[PDB]
Every structure is written in structure tokens, then in C-alpha cells.
């Protein structure tokens, strides 16, 4: 005669140590503006 709940711990703390996903997310942005500038030059 007993019941219990449970609480999760989210972990995935390798990502969580940083903001969350910055491996191919923030770097992609970094190099994608570079693509934009080079294409601007190519079209110019």
C-alpha cells in the first residue's frame, strides 16, 4: 500500500555545459555569412 512519483534529471550536460547545441550550429552561422559576402562579390 504505497505509491511514488519520480523526477527526471535532464542531463545531456555536455551540450548544457555550453548554451546547448553550438557544434554545427553557431559555427555554421559563422561561415555562412562568409559565404554571403563572397557571393555578394561574385554577383558584383
Amino acid at each position: 500500500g504505497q505509491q511514488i512519483f519520480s523526477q527526471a534529471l535532464l542531463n545531456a550536460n555536455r551540450r548544457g555545459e555550453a548554451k546547448t547545441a553550438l557544434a554545427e550550429v553557431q559555427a555554421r552561422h559563422q561561415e555562412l555569412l562568409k559565404l554571403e559576402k563572397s557571393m555578394a562579390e561574385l554577383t558584383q
Binding site: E31, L32, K34, L35, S38, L42
Partner: peptide, 19 residues
Amino acid sequence: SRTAELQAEIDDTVGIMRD
């Protein structure tokens, strides 16, 4: 590695076409 290759290809087309 795809994005770097695309950047390189764009740079090369830029070079050809500056010429």
C-alpha cells in the same frame, strides 16, 4: 566539410571571373 568545399568553390569561381 561540405560548407568549406562550397566556400572554396565560390572563391575559385570568383578568381576565374575576376580574370
